[PDB]
Symmetry: C4
Amino acid sequence: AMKIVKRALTFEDVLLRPGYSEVLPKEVKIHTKLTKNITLNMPLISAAMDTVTEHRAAIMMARLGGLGVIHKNMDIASQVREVKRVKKSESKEYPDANKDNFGRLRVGAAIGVGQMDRVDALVEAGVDVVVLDSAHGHSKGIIDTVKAIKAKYPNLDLIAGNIATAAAAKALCEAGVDAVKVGIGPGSICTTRIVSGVGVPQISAIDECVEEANKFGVPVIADGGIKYSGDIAKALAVGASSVMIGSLLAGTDESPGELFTYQGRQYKSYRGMGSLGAMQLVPEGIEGRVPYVGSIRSVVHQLLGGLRSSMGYVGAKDIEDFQKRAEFVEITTAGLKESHVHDVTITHEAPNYKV
Amino acid sequence: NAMKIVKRALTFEDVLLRPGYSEVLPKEVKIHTKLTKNITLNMPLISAAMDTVTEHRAAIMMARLGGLGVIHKNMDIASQVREVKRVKKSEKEYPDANKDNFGRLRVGAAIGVGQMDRVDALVEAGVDVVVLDSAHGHSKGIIDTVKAIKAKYPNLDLIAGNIATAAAAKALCEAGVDAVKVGIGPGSICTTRIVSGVGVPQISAIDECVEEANKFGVPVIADGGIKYSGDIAKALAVGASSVMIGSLLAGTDESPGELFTYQGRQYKSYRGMGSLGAMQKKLVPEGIEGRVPYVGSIRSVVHQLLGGLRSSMGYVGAKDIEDFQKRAEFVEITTAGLKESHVHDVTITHEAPNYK
Amino acid sequence: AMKIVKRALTFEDVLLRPGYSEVLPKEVKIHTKLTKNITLNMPLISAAMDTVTEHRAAIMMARLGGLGVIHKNMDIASQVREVKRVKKSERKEYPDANKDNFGRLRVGAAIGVGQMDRVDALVEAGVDVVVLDSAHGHSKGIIDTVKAIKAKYPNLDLIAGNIATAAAAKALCEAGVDAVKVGIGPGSICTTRIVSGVGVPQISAIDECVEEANKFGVPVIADGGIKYSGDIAKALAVGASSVMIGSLLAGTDESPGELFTYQGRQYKSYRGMGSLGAMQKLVPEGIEGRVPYVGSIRSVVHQLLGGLRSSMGYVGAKDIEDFQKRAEFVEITTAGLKESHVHDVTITHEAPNY
Amino acid sequence: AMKIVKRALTFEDVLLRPGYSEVLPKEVKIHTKLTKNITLNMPLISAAMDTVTEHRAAIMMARLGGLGVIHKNMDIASQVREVKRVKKSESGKKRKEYPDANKDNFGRLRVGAAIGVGQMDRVDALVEAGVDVVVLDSAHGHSKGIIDTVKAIKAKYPNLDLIAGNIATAAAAKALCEAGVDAVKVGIGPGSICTTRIVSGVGVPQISAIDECVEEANKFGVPVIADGGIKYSGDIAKALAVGASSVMIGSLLAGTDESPGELFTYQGRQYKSYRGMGSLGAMQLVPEGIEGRVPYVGSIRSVVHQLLGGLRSSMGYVGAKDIEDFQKRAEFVEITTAGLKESHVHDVTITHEAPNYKV
Ligand SMILES: C=C(C)c1cccc(C(C)(C)NC(=O)Nc2ccc(Cl)c(N[C@H]3O[C@H](CO)[C@@H](O)[C@H]3O)c2)c1
Ligand SMILES: C=C(C)c1cccc(C(C)(C)NC(=O)Nc2ccc(Cl)c(N[C@H]3O[C@H](CO)[C@@H](O)[C@H]3O)c2)c1
Ligand SMILES: C=C(C)c1cccc(C(C)(C)NC(=O)Nc2ccc(Cl)c(N[C@H]3O[C@H](CO)[C@@H](O)[C@H]3O)c2)c1
Ligand SMILES: C=C(C)c1cccc(C(C)(C)NC(=O)Nc2ccc(Cl)c(N[C@H]3O[C@H](CO)[C@@H](O)[C@H]3O)c2)c1
Ligand SMILES: O=c1[nH]cnc2c1ncn2[C@@H]1O[C@H](COP(=O)(O)O)[C@@H](O)[C@H]1O
Ligand SMILES: O=c1[nH]cnc2c1ncn2[C@@H]1O[C@H](COP(=O)(O)O)[C@@H](O)[C@H]1O
Ligand SMILES: O=c1[nH]cnc2c1ncn2[C@@H]1O[C@H](COP(=O)(O)O)[C@@H](O)[C@H]1O
Ligand SMILES: O=c1[nH]cnc2c1ncn2[C@@H]1O[C@H](COP(=O)(O)O)[C@@H](O)[C@H]1O
Ligand SMILES: [K+]
Ligand SMILES: [K+]
Ligand SMILES: [K+]
Ligand SMILES: [K+]
């Protein structure tokens, strides 16, 4: 008989229970670790996609206290030129900016397997973290590349992904990564589970990996499938240390894509890295568009705002406390229906709730 | 799993009441109940304390029909006092009117954390019950406000919420509330569960809190998420002593606001007190601004709601509410079993007062 | 600390498992029992509603081997008039006709609680079976009416409902019914579960009652919520001796009423008996609606029985009794129901039984 | 209580867990067994449907490593002439163009043909024509008629490979294997155009079906053909991972150049007819299928290419070097409705249409 290992939950299967609280939303700390050695002032990372992060968006992210990861769908020269543009910028309008020993904004940069020349370049341009991202991080090529980079650059922080199992986490942490990115399938533009049948719902994914990663003191980045600030709060409460976000940031002033107008409204194009457009045979992503939403800064303000309200409901003074206090319930579909807005036509724009 | 999953929580659509042997007719069942340890209603419905649901005009009908309205707090003390008095000075056409020892209509009024000056005035205006409402009742701010008010006015009935766990019900009771409001996120216009990830489906919430509050002899008000008369019946069957309703009352004559037209039909604004527009009188809302259909008079709406409650009780075979809770037994259903429970496979021609 | 008795399934939650078959669908027997003393040659009863059954439809149902029930939304004499027309209607064309000992077609008639004078007039008129219906058959009003009727007319077969629990099934059988009707809230036009919060999904409710009423040898009629022919078969495989149908027959020629056109398509009016229009400070438990016009009753019934026979063929059963002994089910997920319907394919030509 | 045997899962109910992988999608081998004795170089069979497979369609599938099955909705001389067109296509240029072609010992493309119950005179004419495998298909394979026909064919033609379906239970698999079949076709209800679960209430969800028959048919060393319900390449992968040895597909191949029938335009878009064999139009009366249309999707070669590409990717995710390793390594999770909505595309309007994702 076939081997079913578990019944796996995603964000919409669970809610956080309220607990006794002596703290206010504005008082809670959202400091967090990005890797074993790098912290963040806010727990959000903009995704390493050509429709999301480039030098401009990586600057806002650091200024607001998180990070952006320059994508790798460009030649070595260009990624160096984008990284240098983040290191040359600077931030009182930005009190929580995420800077380095020289007071320069932190930035990350993506690489593929066996791309040493690119790591060589990014390291000398001053990259703070290298994000080795694959469609399948639990692979011999990725482990080999991890050990080879930690040999050459022992002081360079390295993030590797994407994985979705305790086994994958143990293997990477043993190869010496400084954080693991978790997510096979969750992303809004991802078709992997449909074209290949592979994937693990993200809440169960994060839960499986944090349990293994913690044995190594290795932070877990929850990558993909965030649709609302609440999904962030669920991701952090299960034990992830930071969240990587793409779709919610691509419709902003700061993302690389150009603005255009279709049938009255303004959009930006958003596409998967594994889609046909971005690979120019058998794609695993789609090409789409998202509505224009304004500045990154305002989108980010609402997401963190919801994280803060969540921590106040749970009663947590900081992220680590959040994770000790968190208790969940599993809901049914009808419970999801009641969690959303029901039986009323929305008539004004809500800044943190659309459908 | 290394994450703490406490239970699997059900809401109104996951369950149905099993019919029982019945010796009673729906017209002969008694629907009186308790709002609080010392205030009784003749029927178990309360108006939400919302600036699109309850004001003096709506609060009067609710009292006249046997229930109670809670005047909302989105106004200055002077105005809210004035709203409270219009109801008290209102005073065979309404034979189930819910009155006080002097024979004035009963009325409620909402308050927030540490608004002690607001309470001083509302007591002097003769309010019967002060509703200490907050997004998160299970907090030091609310506990301390409870103990403070119960120290200053030991005979003023206090309601506090909203909660959704036994631990919370326990805290408020020992702080001395006379009734708890249960409901974190079921509201039609609520986005709490989405914007913050916090919530408990309402049926598991009620059930959990009633069990705890009963130990203290404290009634439970089921707040929000009620879509049809049947939910009012489910909610009471689980242990709630009364139900508070928003969107089903916002489209009426007696709610504040004015009617407006959109593509041939008439509507009324309806919005969360956590919405941008309501709060503006930078913000991270937990509500939305919407409209609902104009549905005529509150009286028509309360008639149908209580009508289906009386129908339910007849099916269960219960003479009064407290018997309805002892006899009631539930069936949990699947999603497809609800497709069958609504109307299905047939196009509706004429509208039904009780069903849209 | 609330009382959740079980998890209740409806038709869409189950499927029949195939079995070894030595039988072909043309050659399986679909006779059954309506009551303790009245048999049917096919297991279908047309519903007792003012938009479904009247004499024109009851005559057809009996000619094809089933039975119609004349609805109670009319004065006594007018109901007497309808039953008499069915009775006096009276071999190669309709070989499977369901007749009484006098060669006349069989007919039922619906009555309400406490309506003894109507019963007398119907017994006088030759009604084979009286169907005493209520929103809540498990009440003192209905039990006392059963006891009274059975006392005055012992040899008159009586049906009572609707009910949805074992305990209710026991009470009706002890009061002397000759059948029970199961169905609280599965009806296509029924809003009971929304208005009162009261119901039991049909497959679980049939299961619970059938077990109980077999102890007395009382057939169970499965009432309401039949959408397709496969639900006919699921209803009987679980234990029901017959099934009652409303929506699938309201859009026929014999259904009482006249057709009307809305947006270039033809329709029949179809309404619940607890709707505002069937009654006229009232609190309805049904809606007023319309169903597409689907032609003759004979064409609809032929497909319905044709899916029952085929189902028997899959399970491998010579008759309904064998069908119930062999039937095994699987429970499916909402996803498994999408796959069991047509998916991914626009349907160009509409099917007769889909 | 009514006898409820289990809770049965369909494809959308499960996902494969990735494992440690040392293989690349392009290096994994996808060869598989069709019957106890006939091999395939790819695991896809085109369905025995009068709008899916005929000689043109059968040829292209053999060229790519798979197999076609010529439908039986035609007279015997018609079916024999179409079986021959495949066998003639190559005798012994197009061997370097289709290097993975599925050939017999004579070098001709392999071909299947469908028969109904008690059609021995059809079988005779098909065997003389050079058919490689005869598939005895029925709405209900677990029946006396199918099993006696299986006995009669294997007695008259001992060395002729025979597939028999459709079944959905271990008991049925046990019966057919014991009657001496060489493969079983699993599938009651899952087909895109089928209405058997709706009209007759009968059927088993396809993942559980495959799982129940594989466990039994393996005891006899007999392969399972997972037949119907495939809407995406990932379904092929799941069906194989559960233990099926090959997959039969109708809907995804009916809108192709090779498919029988002709193109037509309806509101400025091009479609092909695609109907269930139990539909009213297909039976020249209580149907068990409907008559539909499918978007035109160009050549069978490009369709097959994406489908196999998805499978290879799935294999790379699991780390498996061949289909046997895929099955010994595979582990699943069960998912909820919200997990399936997460697994698809969500919140983004698909502007460009992907060659392997259409909703
Ligand atoms: C986020 C997604 C899905 C995405 C992003 C960009 C592109 C892609 C595309 C659409 C190209 N798909 C994959 O590339 N699919 C894939 C599937 C299974 C495996 Cl095993 C592998 N190979 C892994 O094994 C090697 C180590 O040995 C690694 O280099 C890596 O290639 C790849 C997908
Ligand atoms: C009905 C809802 C949801 C609503 C209505 C109007 C406005 C609101 C707003 C949108 C303002 N949201 C909250 O206020 N969210 C909130 C979340 C967590 C916490 Cl812990 C707190 N703080 C609590 O602390 C004090 C006691 O300690 C209480 O006053 C309360 O402030 C507030 C929401
Ligand atoms: C098919 C349905 C649902 C329907 C059809 C037409 C009309 C109705 C109406 C809308 C009238 N609803 C009921 O009548 N609801 C009801 C609910 C609970 C109880 Cl307890 C009772 N009382 C029963 O007790 C007496 C026998 O004991 C009966 O006369 C009856 O009155 C009635 C409903
Ligand atoms: C793929 C489907 C569903 C299909 C394809 C073409 C046509 C059909 C039709 C629409 C004609 N329906 C059936 O034929 N329904 C059926 C149902 C139950 C049983 Cl038991 C049987 N009998 C089977 O057992 C005998 C053993 O020898 C066989 O001859 C065979 O007749 C048939 C359906
Ligand atoms: O095309 C691809 N296929 C599958 N996943 C992708 C692809 N491109 C990016 N991703 C992942 O999807 C994430 C974005 O998910 P989203 O924020 O939910 O839209 C990124 O952080 C990547 O990890
Ligand atoms: O905007 C807000 N955010 C969340 N909940 C709210 C907000 N405003 C009102 N509520 C709650 O929603 C209830 C109304 O629910 P309704 O009956 O579904 O419309 C009120 O009784 C309040 O407890
Ligand atoms: O007005 C009503 N309210 C609730 N149930 C009804 C009403 N009228 C008829 N019914 C039931 O619904 C059944 C028909 O349902 P259908 O076969 O699904 O259309 C009838 O046989 C009655 O048992
Ligand atoms: O008319 C029919 N009724 C039920 N199943 C059918 C019918 N015609 C073909 N099938 C089956 O459905 C399969 C096609 O499924 P598809 O791949 O989802 O379109 C074929 O392989 C047959 O086994
Ligand atoms: K809500
Ligand atoms: K219904
Ligand atoms: K189907
Ligand atoms: K996805």
